[PDB]
């Protein structure tokens, strides 16, 4: 059980590509990005914000000079450093940006319906305009061609003793398996007027066929680890997501948090981990995108964020990073590009051990589940008690005050701040409900929280991570695409001169520093705040800051401590008298004040006296840190 937290983002607008984007690919090693435009190809590195190469098949002649065709597909290739390209007219071409070696490598007497590349870059597979499929070797040598609408359930058979949606595009879709051994097609059935799916092996033998199901959608996505193929279906009162096996039978599903016939949906994207999944929704007469998660066969909508459909801000496309499973790229029609990153966390709370209750909070949907562990232990799902909310929350945090670390803060999607205090409230607001602890006659004598405040902001994610240093002081971080830097903020408490459940917190100050502040933490006992820069530089910032007090973290010799890597998290400790720092990376590498100490660590924790670790070698151990 964990919850994702946004780590860092990268936004890039104002790309001068001719015409408009059509598609794009990514240059993994090069660190740049491809662009499919109406006139030619463009390559640019994001952090550079500089174009490297330009071409125009309009200038060459293949692309309609007036501009009428589109690039069906662009796919980066690393062996030859030359990128293949597909034409709406049905022309496959190869070129290299190094010297502009554009030259037609083949064509068909139809348009290229779609271009597919084997996950191992071994093979290619394309669809024609005359409803047939063309398989070819690595170098465009035609392997075979076969008609799409044959009549069989597939080679894999069984032994034993109403119409397409109005908003359907009728565009066929295909996908690979995660092993490069099976691929599934999702052509709309011309005969039944519905959607149909078939699956074939690496040999290109017709393995299996889908089953008659009403309300089928056009979307499709194979799970990277296999055995699961995603699809969407609308039922008389609800839009749901269903799954399929390699046998091509329905198995498992989960519903959506929206009403009946409200919004349009696009296809589904898997992260590199095969764990996280992302869904694209279109506001049907305000699009959105959501990050779901399955846990113990329960589906958790861990994240979501929306956007406006106004043309330039209307999104063009997006893509998972095929290297880091928690990295995303996206681009919108205002010739703009953007990048996003996340990392895991648990969201625990620590205060005075006598008074603290070892409470733990988890986020799901428009609600938060809380479990107090000083007295109770419940196995997720379920929880001690839950708090409801109108629309989905994004991230939460506990109060950082000692002997008080039992009240948290909630950040809803629409810039709403919810305060819940566990004081001796006589009457409980209806938002608080009890989980497994409640029942018919079962009774407990714990202390419950209550709603306190619903604040707003007083001047798409205008702010980054949220921290609650003290009852009245919150902190966040911004960015800047030009001249990369971050800004701290000082959202103090505005007094209650309105509905006492309201009040807009305003920026007392905006502390600005250069570079990307990837992380930050603080200690209540020391009342000190220290951040980690993207460089691994460690900088204590005086949260008091009578005048912008900044100081890089000092070693025992009074010199800077520059972490050799970007930490996945940060921590303060009280070793002997030293206020040393703690951190680690995803690579099990552990360092202390720029001293590596171990490489088998998978997790750690400390509650004011002891450091506990989880070796990758299946062991734990404690230490008296004083």
């Amino acid at each position: 059980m964990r919850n994702l937290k946004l780590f860092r983002t990268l936004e890039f607008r104002d790309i001068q590509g001719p015409g408009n984007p059509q598609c794009f690919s990514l240059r993994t090693e090069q660190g740049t990005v491809l662009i499919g435009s109406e006139h030619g190809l463009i390559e640019v590195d994001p952090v550079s914000r500089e174009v490297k190469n330009e071409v125009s098949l309009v200038a060459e002649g293949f692309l309609p000079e007036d501009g009428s065709g589109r690039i069906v597909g662009v796919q980066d290739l690393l062996d030859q450093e030359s990128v293949c390209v597909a034409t709406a007219s049905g022309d496959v071409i190869l070129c290299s940006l190094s010297t502009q070696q554009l030259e037609c490598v083949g064509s068909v007497a139809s348009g290229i319906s779609v271009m597919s590349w084997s996950p191992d870059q071994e093979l290619v597979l394309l669809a024609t305009g005359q409803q047939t499929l063309i398989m070819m070797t690595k170098d465009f040598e035609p392997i075979l061609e076969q008609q799409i609408h044959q009549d069989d359930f597939g080679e894999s058979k069984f032994i034993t003793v109403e119409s397409a949606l109005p908003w359907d595009d009728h565009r066929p879709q295909v996908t690979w398996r995660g092993d490069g051994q099976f691929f599934a097609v999702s052509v709309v059935c011309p005969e039944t007027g519905a959607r149909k799916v078939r699956v074939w092996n690496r040999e290109f033998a017709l393995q299996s066929t889908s089953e008659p199901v009403a309300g089928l959608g056009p979307a499709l996505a194979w799970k990277p680890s296999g055995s699961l193929i995603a699809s969407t279906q609308d039922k008389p009162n609800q839009q749901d997501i269903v799954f399929f096996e390699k046998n091509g039978l329905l198995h498992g599903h989960f519903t959506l948090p929206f009403l009946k016939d409200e919004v349009k949906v696009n296809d589904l994207l898997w992260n590199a981990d095969s764990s996280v999944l992302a869904v694209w929704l279109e506001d049907l007469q305000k699009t959105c995108v959501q990050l779901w998660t399955v846990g113990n066969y329960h589906w958790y909508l861990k994240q979501s964020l929306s956007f406006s459909t106004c043309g330039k801000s209307k999104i063009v496309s997006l893509m998972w990073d095929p290297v880091t499973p928690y990295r995303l790229h996206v681009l919108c029609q205002g010739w703009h590009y953007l990048a996003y990153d996340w990392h895991w966390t648990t969201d625990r709370s620590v205060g005075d051990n006598s008074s603290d209750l070892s409470n733990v909070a988890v986020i799901d949907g428009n609600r938060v589940l809380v479990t107090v562990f000083r007295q109770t232990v419940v196995p997720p799902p379920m929880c001690t008690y839950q708090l409801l909310f109108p629309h989905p929350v994004n991230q939460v945090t506990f109060l950082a005050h000692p002997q008080k670390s039992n009240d948290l803060a909630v950040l809803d999607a629409s810039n709403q701040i919810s305060v819940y205090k566990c004081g001796d409230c006589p009457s409980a607001d209806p938002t608080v409900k009890l989980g497994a602890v409640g029942g018919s006659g079962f009774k407990v004598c714990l202390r419950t929280p209550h709603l306190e405040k619903r604040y707003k902001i007083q001047f798409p994610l205008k702010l980054g991570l949220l921290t609650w240093i003290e009852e009245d002081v919150f902190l966040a971080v911004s960015h800047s695409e030009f001249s990369p830097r971050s800004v701290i903020h000082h959202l103090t408490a505005a007094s209650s001169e309105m509905d006492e459940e309201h009040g807009q917190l305003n920026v007392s100050s905006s502390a600005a520093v250069d570079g990307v502040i990837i992380s930050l933490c603080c200690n209540s006992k020391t009342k000190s705040v220290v951040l980690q820069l993207a460089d691994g530089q460690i900088f204590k910032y005086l949260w008091e800051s009578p005048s912008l007090a900044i100081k890089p973290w000092k070693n025992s010799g009074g010199f800077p401590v520059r972490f050799p890597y970007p930490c996945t998290q940060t921590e303060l400790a009280m070793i002997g008298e030293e206020e040393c720092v703690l951190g680690l990376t995803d690579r099990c590498r552990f360092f202390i004040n720029d001293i590596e100490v171990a490489s088998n660590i998978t997790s750690f924790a400390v509650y004011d006296e002891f450091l506990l670790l989880t070796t990758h070698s299946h062991t734990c151990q404690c230490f008296c840190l004083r």
Binding site: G441, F442, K443
Partner: protein, 353 residues
């Protein structure tokens, strides 16, 4: 040894007998799982049940002409667990229209899903035998088995997946050899799986393979430092809870307990409100006569007392209930009498205030 006239007379007489019977278990199928039959079995002192699942895919049932739905199995599990019995499932690898990957996926599902999370497990590989339709199906050369190596790998992978609380009871059938058209040569398979999992260097955590008796009789390892361990999960809507004493360094186990909170929906009104049921309790080892105290060994050192008091404390505080009920064998009731437990219906019970 006393001639009787009805069930109840025999029950009352066996109460005071010295053979000290501790329970019975019966097989069944989900059709006969309504609360009427459960109440009937409550009158017999039965403890555990057999169902026969054979799959996790509904289509297979009609393919196998089973004649019911997997759903009914699921509600039978939920209802029986709410009542307080134990359940052992039957798994049926290498079935028609089932790939090897299908078997792996379904077996993983069998524990990944909170729907099932069963307690007792039994496995029986497919065996084509003359007389059945499958006999002709294979005879027509249309139903094929695996090679023995495939079965060994399948079993070895499966054993790596069993959750610690689940206990395996048997592997393979006991059918005479010169009758099966696809019977494996080896009457012994657990050993072959053990060899294979040594080859792969991955270990299993079954209860039967970590109790003191088997571990000593097969490896001669003496426990040295035994401590407590607590775990919990969710199954059929229940808040299950598992307690044990065991020595972790050798991973050898001595005593166990299974206790949960009753579901909001129940059949026995005696459990209505402030009630937590303890499904079962047991310490492994060997038989020690009730009068005898210490042949060294580990069966009368007062271990059960600590588990009872701690489970009671948990139910009083964490469950927040108000009265503890428990099922028991006919003789075992007297045991609970020593702790101040009194009878009510077929259930032993103690007030919690």
């Amino acid at each position: 040894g006393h001639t009787s006239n009805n069930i109840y007379e025999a029950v009352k007489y066996s109460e005071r007998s010295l053979t000290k019977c501790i329970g019975i278990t019966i097989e069944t199928r989900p059709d006969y799982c309504m609360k009427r039959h459960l109440s009937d079995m409550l009158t017999y002192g039965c403890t555990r049940l057999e169902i026969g699942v054979q799959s996790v895919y509904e289509d297979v049932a009609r393919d196998t002409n089973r004649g019911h739905t997997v759903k009914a199995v699921c509600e039978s599990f939920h209802l029986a667990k709410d009542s307080g019995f134990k359940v052992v499932a039957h798994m049926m690898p290498d079935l028609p229209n089932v790939g090897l990957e299908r078997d792996i996926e379904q077996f993983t599902e069998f524990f990944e899903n909170p729907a099932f999370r069963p307690d007792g497990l039994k496995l029986y590989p497919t065996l084509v035998i003359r007389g059945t339709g499958l006999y002709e199906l294979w005879k027509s050369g249309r139903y094929k088995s695996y090679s023995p190596s495939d079965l060994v790998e399948l079993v070895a992978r499966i054993l790596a997946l069993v959750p610690p609380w689940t206990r395996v009871y048997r592997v393979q059938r006991d059918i005479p050899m010169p009758l099966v058209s696809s019977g494996v040569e080896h009457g012994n398979l657990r050993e072959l799986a053990l060899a294979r999992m040594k080859d792969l260097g991955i270990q299993c955590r079954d209860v039967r393979t970590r109790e003191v008796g088997i571990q000593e009789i097969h490896h001669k390892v003496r426990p040295y430092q035994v401590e407590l361990v607590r775990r919990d999960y969710v199954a059929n809507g229940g808040w299950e809870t598992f307690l044990s004493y065991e020595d972790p360094d050798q991973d050898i186990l001595i005593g166990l307990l299974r206790l949960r909170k009753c579901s909001e929906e129940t059949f026995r009104f005696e459990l209505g409100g402030g009630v937590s049921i303890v499904r079962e309790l047991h310490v492994y080892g060997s038989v020690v006569p009730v009068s005898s105290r210490d042949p060294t060994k580990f069966q009368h050192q007062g271990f059960g007392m600590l588990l009872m008091e701690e489970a009671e404390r948990i139910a009083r505080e964490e469950h927040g209930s108000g009265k503890i009920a428990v099922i028991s064998g006919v003789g075992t009731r007297n045991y609970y009498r020593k702790i101040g437990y009194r009878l009510q219906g077929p259930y032993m019970v103690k007030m919690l205030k």
